[PDB]
Amino acid sequence: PQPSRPRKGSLGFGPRKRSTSETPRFNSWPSDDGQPGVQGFAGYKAGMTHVVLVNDEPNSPREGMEETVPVTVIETPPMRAVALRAYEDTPYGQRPLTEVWTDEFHSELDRTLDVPEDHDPDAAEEQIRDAHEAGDLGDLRLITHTVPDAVPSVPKKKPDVMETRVGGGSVSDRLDHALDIVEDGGEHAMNDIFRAGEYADVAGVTKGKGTQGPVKRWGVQKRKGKHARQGWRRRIGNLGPWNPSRVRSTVPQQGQTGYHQRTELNKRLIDIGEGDEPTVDGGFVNYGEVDGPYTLVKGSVPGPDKRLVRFRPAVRPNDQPRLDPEVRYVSNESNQG
C-alpha cells in the first residue's frame, strides 16, 4: 500500500546555498501606523541564560506566577543613521533617487566605505522634496551602520552597513523626522525604537555547517535494519523514477547547509538594559563578557555568537504587546559546567 508521508524538509528556503551577505537584509517592513520612526535596529549575539519572569499572560491560569524563560543575550550598542536615501515610484518598481549624508563620521567607517569628502545635502534634499511635490516619492529609508568597536567581545572594527526603512505619520512629517536624525550624527539606540515587552522579528545568517548529507540537511531517514549494513547508511533510495528521466531539484541531496539568511518571526523582547547584569560567570563561552547596552530576546536567535543580528518590529504579530515584563531573576551562573 505504501503509507503516505510529508516530503523531507521544506522547499521554501532555497536554493540552500551560501548567503551573499553575512549582514541580513529584510525583505519586508512594518506598516506606517504610529509616529515616524526607524523600523529596525541591530546588534551582536553573545549567548544564552535564563531568567525568571512573572507570568504576564492575562489568559494564563498562571498569570502572576514565577516562570523560567530562556533568553539570548544580544549586545545592542547605539548605531548611526549616516544618511537618508529616497526612492521614487516608477513603471518598474522603486528606485533610489538620492541620498542625504552628513559630515560627522565614526572614526572607522572608512574601513568599509569611501567616506564622502564633498557632498551637497541641500541639493539632495531639494530633489527629494520636488519628487514629493510631484508625488513620485516612494518610501524613505536610512543608511545605517554599527559600531563593533563599542563591543569588545567582537574582533571586528569594520562596521556593518545596512539600510533601514522609516515608517511614520505623513510622508512629509517622516521625511523631516528622517533628516533630523541624520543631520545630528544619526546616533540612535534600541530604546528609541523598541520597548521591552514588544514583539520583534530577528533576522540573521545561521551557523554554517559546510557540506552535509541528506539525513542532516533534509531530514531523510537512515538506511534501516539489514539495509544499513549492506554498504549504504546515509544515502536515499533513489534520485527518482525511470521517467521523467532526469533528477528533479525536489529530491533531497547533499550540499551547503547552514550560513543561510533567516527571518525568525515574533520574538518577544524580554528586556532592554545596559551593564553587566546579564553576563555569565567565567564569561560567555567563545564570546566574552557583557557590560554595556544589551537586549534580552526570548528564546533563540539564528546565527552564532558574534554574528550581527537585525531587529524589526513584528510585521505579523499574534499577540498584543504586554510591556515591561517583571524580571525577578537573571541567571549569571557559569555556562561552563
Binding site: 498562571r62 514565577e66 531517514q221
Partner: protein, 132 residues
C-alpha cells in the same frame, strides 16, 4: 484536553509494559493505543504522563487478565519539565485503570502521582494517597 501545565517527553510506546498503580487486581498493563493520538509513518505511537491510553492486562487476577481496558498514565521514568524549569521523573512507569467517565475502576491508588494529572482527571486525583 486541558493543559497539563508541564511539558512531557512521552516515555512510553505502544507495546510497553507498565505498572498498574491501583487495587483492581491488575498488576501489569500493556499499552495498546493512545487516546486522540495520530503519529506518522514508521513512528511508534507514543504515550506519557497525563495521557489516556487503551491497555490490555498482562498480569493479575485471571478475571482481569486479557481484558482490554482504558487507563491514565500516572508516572513515568522519563523526565518532564515544570513551569519553573525543574525536571521531574519517577522510579517507575505506572497507570491507573479508568472507566468511561474516567473514574478509577479501583478503590485505592498505590504509590505517588504527578500533580499535573489532577488538572485533568479529578476523580483519579481525589483518590491519590500522595500527590507530588
Amino acid at each position: 484536553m486541558e493543559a497539563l501545565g508541564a511539558d512531557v517527553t512521552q516515555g512510553l510506546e505502544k507495546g510497553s509494559l507498565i505498572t498498574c498503580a491501583d487495587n483492581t487486581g491488575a498488576r501489569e498493563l500493556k499499552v495498546i493505543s493512545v487516546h486522540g493520538y495520530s503519529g506518522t509513518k514508521n513512528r511508534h505511537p507514543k504515550a506519557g504522563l497525563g495521557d489516556k491510553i487503551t491497555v490490555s492486562v498482562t498480569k493479575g487476577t485471571p478475571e482481569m487478565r486479557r481484558q482490554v481496558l482504558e487507563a491514565v498514565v500516572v508516572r513515568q521514568r522519563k523526565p518532564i519539565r515544570r513551569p519553573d524549569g525543574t525536571r521531574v521523573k519517577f522510579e517507575d512507569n505506572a497507570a491507573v485503570i479508568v472507566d468511561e467517565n474516567e473514574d478509577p475502576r479501583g478503590t485505592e491508588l498505590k504509590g505517588p502521582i504527578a500533580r499535573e494529572v489532577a488538572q485533568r482527571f479529578g476523580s483519579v486525583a481525589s483518590a491519590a494517597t500522595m500527590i507530588v
